[PDB]
Every structure is written in structure tokens, then in C-alpha cells.
Amino acid sequence: WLITGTEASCENEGEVLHIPNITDNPCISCVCLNQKAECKQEKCAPLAEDCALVVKQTGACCEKCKG
């Protein structure tokens, strides 16, 4: 069957296996863990809440603020 199921497998130990519903978010990436997508998500806390955002990249997950 051309379907691998909901589980993603890889050949390298500790590489990367990006998945939509998983890595769809920049903060979520997978790494070929034990032939499995070692996907983990990153979350950071704000500063001012409405801070001018002194930290932030064009394509970075995390983000700090304060202008």
C-alpha cells in the first residue's frame, strides 16, 4: 500500500522529517529519531504583551519583544 499511515519513518538517526500537521509551524520540526519523526514544538513568552518587539527574524520561530 502506498500509505505509510499517521506515523512517519526515516532512515537516518537524528536528521529531519518535516510533517505538515506537525512541522506546519516553524516552531515544529522533526528529527529522524529511532526511524521516527522526533518532532518537537517551540514556544516562547512575550514581554510587554503589546511590546514593540525588539526581537524577531523574517523566518525564525521564537521571538522576544520590547521594541
UniProtKB/TrEMBL annotation:
Protein's cellular compartments: Secreted
Q: Which cysteines are joined by disulfide bonds?
A: 10-32, 27-61, 30-39, 44-62, 51-65
What name goes with this protein?
Crossveinless 2
Name the source organism: Danio rerio (Zebrafish)
Gene name linked to the record = bmper
